[PDB]
Design an enzyme around this catalytic site. Structure first.
Site, PDB file in Angstrom:
ATOM      1  N   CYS C  16      37.344  40.794  37.946  1.00 51.71           N
ATOM      2  CA  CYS C  16      37.414  41.938  38.841  1.00 51.71           C
ATOM      3  C   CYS C  16      38.713  42.683  38.593  1.00 51.71           C
ATOM      4  CB  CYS C  16      37.303  41.502  40.301  1.00 51.71           C
ATOM      5  SG  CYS C  16      38.474  40.249  40.831  1.00 51.71           S
ATOM      6  N   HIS C 281      40.306  39.587  45.714  1.00 55.60           N
ATOM      7  CA  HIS C 281      39.286  40.370  45.039  1.00 55.60           C
ATOM      8  C   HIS C 281      39.885  41.730  44.726  1.00 55.60           C
ATOM      9  CE1 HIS C 281      34.786  41.611  44.757  1.00 55.60           C
ATOM     10  NE2 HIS C 281      35.530  42.221  43.853  1.00 55.60           N
TER      11      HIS C 281
HETATM   12  N1  LIG Z   1      40.142  37.582  41.786  1.00 54.10           N
HETATM   13  C1  LIG Z   1      39.276  37.981  40.661  1.00 54.10           C
HETATM   14  C2  LIG Z   1      38.045  38.572  41.169  1.00 54.10           C
HETATM   15  C3  LIG Z   1      37.154  37.986  41.935  1.00 54.10           C
HETATM   16  S1  LIG Z   1      35.514  38.467  41.843  1.00 54.10           S
HETATM   17  C4  LIG Z   1      34.625  37.502  43.079  1.00 54.10           C
HETATM   18  O1  LIG Z   1      35.379  39.852  42.237  1.00 54.10           O
HETATM   19  O2  LIG Z   1      34.967  38.023  40.584  1.00 54.10           O
END
Ligand SMILES: *NC[C@H](*)CS(C)(=O)=O
Ligand SMILES: [Zn+2]
Lengths: 602, 75, 340
Positions: C16, C281
């Site tokens: 992400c 996220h």
């Molecule tokens: N912290 C990295 C991203 C998480 S995600 C659930 O969006 O893959």
């Protein structure tokens, strides 16, 4: 926090300033001038013209820049402020320190004096102003007597200037806070906050009644304040750069100013259009002290960043040009000579000798272990001299060099003081044996061999000169104790050592227990049976050759065949048999990782 | 030489280093002055992270060069 | 219940950070054209006949996939029904080779990935320019993300200035003191600071430790200002989940060596949702201005990029949510400003 042991390589007598002069005081009764230098010595001079050598005495107890000095009690006592965070009380008639005041947490920049109240204030970078009564600073030792402190609070930034009037009723502080803060030292009451300066204030003056103040700022402006009306009456713009020194006559009508642009003026306060260029200096002006033996002052003493203190005649001050260019006097009347400051330093490969260049471009060769100068090499090229004395050796750093005083100060810290294990032959000494010597240990046993707690005297190989200052301090400039190497036997110095010397020094010097040998691991593998080995940092490649020959391929003296049968390589370079592993890993090992050696048969 | 590190709050601290000093030693000194573990530190000089195992000479870090201290906001 | 022409990426694991940086950098004023030119050079070089070129080839494949998928959505809307997204498998493998940190499916930093991508592009581009000169597109990171910085230090004893000229990709900025604005924070980064106490300047003029004043001024100005918000403090390490006021227009004339009339307009924000430095996220929001009047229907509106879903947000709603008036639940981490 962490206590360090320092010492200074210097001559027994230092007649001349080895750095710039930060402060000046004149004593009219005895015709005596005091200089507070960046070399940490306060010197006493005669100002009779007929006296061929003005030097009288040297006042030696500070370990950093002496930022301000004040004469008080009819010249009997002098008070000194230094960057070693200490304020010292001296016997100005004789030249010895009576007391040390350790109430400041940082550099002490300013001292102020009130003649009638016998009151002295001290301020510095720790944002604190401390008020002292000189009559109660007749205290010998803390055990004998103790003194209590008064403080003025309010500063939000570091203080660079102080000023009290004679009557001792107004005290003004100048800071990098840009605003002048005023108190009443009698009741420690905040009175005013004068605004108008755009940079640091490094010069403050007050008249006798404390109703007006002159402020010279690093922005180039001199402001005259009315403390009754809490306002700036006038602003004088006479300097192209910062104003660092201010002086005013008794009637408080003419101001003598100087600063970073190496010019000194005399500006009439009540008609600023008339101003006289007194002189052009050679270095930025740090302090000025008038000869106050006449109603119009006859001379002025200027201290610069150079080691020469000059006196300029004011005779002839009375033209018509708004901005005259011709100086009143082109040459000084009285000149106090100065020395040369060590400006650049280079520790050589053996980590025992130093090359220094000074302000007169003279190169000197120093022996740090014996705390002496080996020779003066003249005005030869510094870098060519460094390359001429390259030696193919590695010794770990075990000391630092500071040139803040214009003199060699060598600092020992427990992190690295014992990192240098060398052989007696490779360090100039001898026995029929070649023992392994620790330079920090030897130096510590040499610096305090007059201490009775270290006897059974010295390291048995060398002695430092008895006049060597030994300083116990903290990482940050806070000096705990200073003594000469020969004074360690006295009762007072013995007790102050029992209280001040750290345990890492005590173990090596008093307990006589030796430091830890340092070892490096190294791989040894064939060159066109592999095993990892570790050994001392010092062992010669001869011993690695002997281990390889006598144990890997061993199918008249036994040691003779070892040198002519096996040859050792590091990154495709044949190793000198007498070379130690430190040197191989430092020079011949430019790769990353652990040292690896390769062996081949002749 | 003496270099500068701008810490998380914007305050600038001073480090006394040598040209032959690995990034790990610099991070140890920053831990001494600031308390951030080296494994959590990120040093940025002239828009480049200073990777471990390389010395200060490898990055042309001279006297009074400013390093920037940041952390890893993992997501 | 209809999708949008603009196309996102896929989670593919814990990706992400990379997706956020890629959707920001796909909307930069001249990143796509520059990468296409560099890929033209690399394709010609290969036809004339490496690990470094793999990043550029992966980026070009990603960009062509994004744009062709968006176009196919425009002329065949029913061909796709549930989601409109692609996946940067190749690009992640390439970064994984060029940096072993990205081995696996663990959570990483977004600014670090942006820095890695930009630095790798810059080094490939310098290598390629060297190869060419052995035999205007060679300054892409330099022209569009790189700026020059002037660091003045003034001793407070001798008042002698010293100049250091350094480079910057990002403007790294505090978010709280040891309702604040971005001007306050840039000032904390670049206005006059005094060095006192334990931190003391060593002056070669005085040969002494002295108090000093440092100031940072901007000399050369990149086309895209990226501001890296230090939304983290040493409490043992915490996240400062309270944003500061972010203007839509920014002018760096106060901290500039020479006077300029150059406004910067915010066009992308990278946001971290979480209460921890070590997990969260990442989300990216970008402002659409230029690349079918349907495509121009979105002009002036903000796009929110979750993993694979795209939502169109008005400017007022986005700015209200980003403002610390209410709890935003996703603090800004990377702020992108472009010249106007
Ligand atoms: N912290 C990295 C991203 C998480 S995600 C659930 O969006 O893959
Ligand atoms: Zn200086």
């Amino acid at each position: 926090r962490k206590v360090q042991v320092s010492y200074v390589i210097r001559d027994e007598v230092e007649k001349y300033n080895r750095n710039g002069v930060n402060a000046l005081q004149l004593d009219p009764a005895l015709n005596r001038l005091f200089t507070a230098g960046r070399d940490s010595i306060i010197r006493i001079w005669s100002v009779n013209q007929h006296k061929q050598d003005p030097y009288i005495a040297s006042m030696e107890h500070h370990t950093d820049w002496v930022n301000d000095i004040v004469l008080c009690c009819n010249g009997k006592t002098l008070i000194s402020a230094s960057s070693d965070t200490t304020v010292k009380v001296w016997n100005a008639h004789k030249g010895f320190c009576m007391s040390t005041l350790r109430t400041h947490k940082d550099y002490v920049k300013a001292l102020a004096y009130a003649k009638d109240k016998e009151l002295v204030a001290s301020a510095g970078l720790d944002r604190q102003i401390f008020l002292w009564d000189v009559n109660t600073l007749t205290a010998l030792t803390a055990s004998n007597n103790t003194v209590t402190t008064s403080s003025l609070s309010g500063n939000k930034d570091s203080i660079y200037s102080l000023a009290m009037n004679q009557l001792g009723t107004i005290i003004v502080s100048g800071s990098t806070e840009k605003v002048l803060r005023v108190w009443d030292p009698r009741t420690c009451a905040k009175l005013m906050k004068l605004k108008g300066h755009t940079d640091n204030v490094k010069a403050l003056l007050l008249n006798r009644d404390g109703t007006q103040c002159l402020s010279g700022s690093s922005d180039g402006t001199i402001r005259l304040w009315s403390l009754g009306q809490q306002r700036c009456i006038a602003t004088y713009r006479v300097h192209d750069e910062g104003v660092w020194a201010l002086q005013v006559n008794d009637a408080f009508t003419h101001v003598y100013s100087g600063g970073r642009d190496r010019k000194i003026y005399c500006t009439d306060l009540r008609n600023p259009d008339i101003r006289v260029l007194i002189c052009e200096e050679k270095a930025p002006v740090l302090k000025m002290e008038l000869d106050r033996s006449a109603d119009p002052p006859p001379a002025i003493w200027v201290a610069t960043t150079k080691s020469t203190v000059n006196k300029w005649t004011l005779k002839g001050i009375h033209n018509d040009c708004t901005n005259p260019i011709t100086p009143l006097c082109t040459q000084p009347d009285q000149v106090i000579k100065g020395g040369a400051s060590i400006i650049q330093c280079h520790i050589l490969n053996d980590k025992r000798h130093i090359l220094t260049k000074d302000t007169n471009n003279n190169v000197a060769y120093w022996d740090v272990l014996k705390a002496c100068k080996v020779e003066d090499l003249g005005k030869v090229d510094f870098e060519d001299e460094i390359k001429k004395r390259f030696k193919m050796v590695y010794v770990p750093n075990w000391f630092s060099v500071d040139l803040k005083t214009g003199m060699l100060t060598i600092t020992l810290d427990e992190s690295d003081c014992f990192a240098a294990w060398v052989s007696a032959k490779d360090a100039g000494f001898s026995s029929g044996s070649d023992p392994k010597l620790n330079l920090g240990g030897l130096l510590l046993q040499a610096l305090l061999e007059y201490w009775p707690r270290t006897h059974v005297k010295g390291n048995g190989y060398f002695q430092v000169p008895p006049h060597t200052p030994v300083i116990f301090g903290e990482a940050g400039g806070r000096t705990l104790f200073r003594l000469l190497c020969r004074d360690s036997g006295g009762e007072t110095e013995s007790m102050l050592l029992n209280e001040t010397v750290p345990q890492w020094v005590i173990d090596i010097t008093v307990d006589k227990n030796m430091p830890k040998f340092n070892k490096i691991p190294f791989y040894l593998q064939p060159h066109a049976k592999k095993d990892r080995l570790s050994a001392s940092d010092m062992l010669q490649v001869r011993k690695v050759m002997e281990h390889v020959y006598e144990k890997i391929i061993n199918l008249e003296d036994i040691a003779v065949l070892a040198e002519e049968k096996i040859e050792l390589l590091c990154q495709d370079q044949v190793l000198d048999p007498n070379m130690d592993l430190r040197t191989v890993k430092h020079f011949i090992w430019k790769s990353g990782g652990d040292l690896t050696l390769h062996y081949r048969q002749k | 030489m003496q270099i500068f590190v701008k810490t998380l709050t914007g305050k600038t601290i001073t480090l006394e280093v040598e040209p032959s000093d690995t990034i790990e030693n610099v991070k140890a000194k920053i831990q001494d002055k600031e308390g951030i573990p080296p494994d959590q530190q990120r040093l940025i000089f002239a828009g480049k992270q200073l990777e471990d195992g390389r010395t200060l000479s490898d990055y042309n870090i001279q006297k009074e060069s400013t390093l920037h201290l940041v952390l890893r906001l993992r997501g | 219940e209809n999708l949008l022409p603009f196309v996102g990426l896929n989670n593919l694991g814990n990706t992400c950070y990379l997706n956020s940086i890629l959707q920001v950098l796909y909307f930069c004023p001249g990143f796509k054209s520059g990468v296409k030119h560099l890929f033209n050079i690399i394709s010609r070089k290969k036809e004339a006949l490496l690990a470094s070129y793999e990043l550029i080839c992966s980026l070009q494949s990603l960009i062509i996939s994004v744009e062709q998928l968006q176009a196919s959505f425009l002329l065949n809307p029913e061909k796709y029904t549930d989601e409109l997204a692609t996946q940067p498998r190749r690009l992640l493998n390439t970064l994984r080779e060029l940096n072993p940190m990205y081995e696996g499916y663990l959570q990483h930093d977004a600014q670090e990935v942006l820095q890695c991508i930009l630095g790798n592009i810059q080094e490939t581009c310098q290598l390629l320019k060297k190869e060419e000169v052995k035999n205007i597109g060679f300054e892409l990171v330099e022209k569009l993300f790189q700026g020059q910085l002037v660091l003045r230090t003034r001793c407070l004893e001798c008042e002698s200035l010293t100049e250091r000229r350094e480079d910057f990709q990002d403007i790294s900025v505090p978010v709280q003191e040891d309702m604040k604005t971005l001007r306050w924070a840039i000032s904390q980064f670049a206005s006059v600071e005094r060095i006192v106490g334990e931190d003391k300047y060593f002056c070669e003029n005085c040969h002494h430790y002295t108090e000093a004043e440092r100031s940072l001024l901007f000399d050369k100005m990149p086309e895209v200002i990226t501001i890296h918000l230090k939304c983290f403090a040493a409490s043992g390490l915490s996240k400062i989940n309270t944003p500061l006021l972010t203007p839509l227009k920014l002018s760096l004339e106060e901290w500039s060596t020479k006077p300029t009339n150059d406004s910067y307009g915010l066009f992308a924000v990278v946001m971290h949702s979480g209460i921890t430095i070590s997990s969260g996220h990442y989300t990216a929001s970008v402002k659409v201005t230029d690349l079918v009047q349907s495509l121009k229907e979105y002009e002036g509106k903000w796009l929110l990029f979750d993993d694979s879903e795209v939502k169109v947000t008005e400017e007022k709603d986005f700015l209200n949510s980003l403002s610390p008036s209410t709890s935003p639940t996703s603090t800004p981490y990377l702020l992108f400003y472009k010249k106007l």
